[PDB]
């Protein structure tokens, strides 16, 4: 990762625009739940 936060090769060829398509390191990332995809339309309207 160069200092422009772009993943580049040895001869400066772009592989990823950002690390992991988002620019975030993998040490701190956690397993989470969206809780928006799974509820139905009635449940979504009731809860939000």
């Amino acid at each position: 990762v160069k200092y422009d936060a772009t993943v580049r090769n040895s001869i400066n060829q772009v592989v990823q625009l950002r690390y992991g398509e988002d620019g975030l390191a993998g040490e701190s990332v956690e397993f989470q739940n969206l809780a928006t995809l799974k509820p139905s339309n009635k449940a979504f309207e009731k809860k939000f």
């Binding site: 950002r18 988002d22 620019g23």
Partner: protein, 97 residues
């Protein structure tokens, strides 16, 4: 974006854990009503999300790239930090927010 109902997804910082920490650090009572106006939550989320920078720039190309990179965390952030969820199950206060 997500088919097959795969709700499990990796995000940087675990929102429910920090909400629970804010509950159990400031000793708030979920039984009593809280003092937190909904637009404080609204523009708190809006003013927060402008300071999560990945693609830093001002031109619309970098703005679109930053929105694309931040989109999943933003779309989870607005869902978790909604006004109704806060008013019902989290019951956080102003300085807690």
């Amino acid at each position: 974006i997500f088919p097959t109902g795969d709700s499990k997804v990796v995000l940087p910082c675990n929102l429910l854990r920090m909400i629970w920490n804010a509950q159990k650090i400031f000793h708030i009572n979920p039984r009593l009503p809280s003092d937190l106006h909904p637009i404080k939550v609204v523009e708190g989320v809006k003013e927060l999300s402008k300071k999560l920078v990945i693609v830093n720039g001002d031109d619309p190309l970098s703005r679109q790239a930053q929105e694309n990179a931040t989109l999943l965390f933003n779309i989870h952030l607005r869902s978790t930090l909604c006004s109704r969820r806060m008013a019902e199950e989290f019951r956080l206060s102003g300085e807690a927010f």
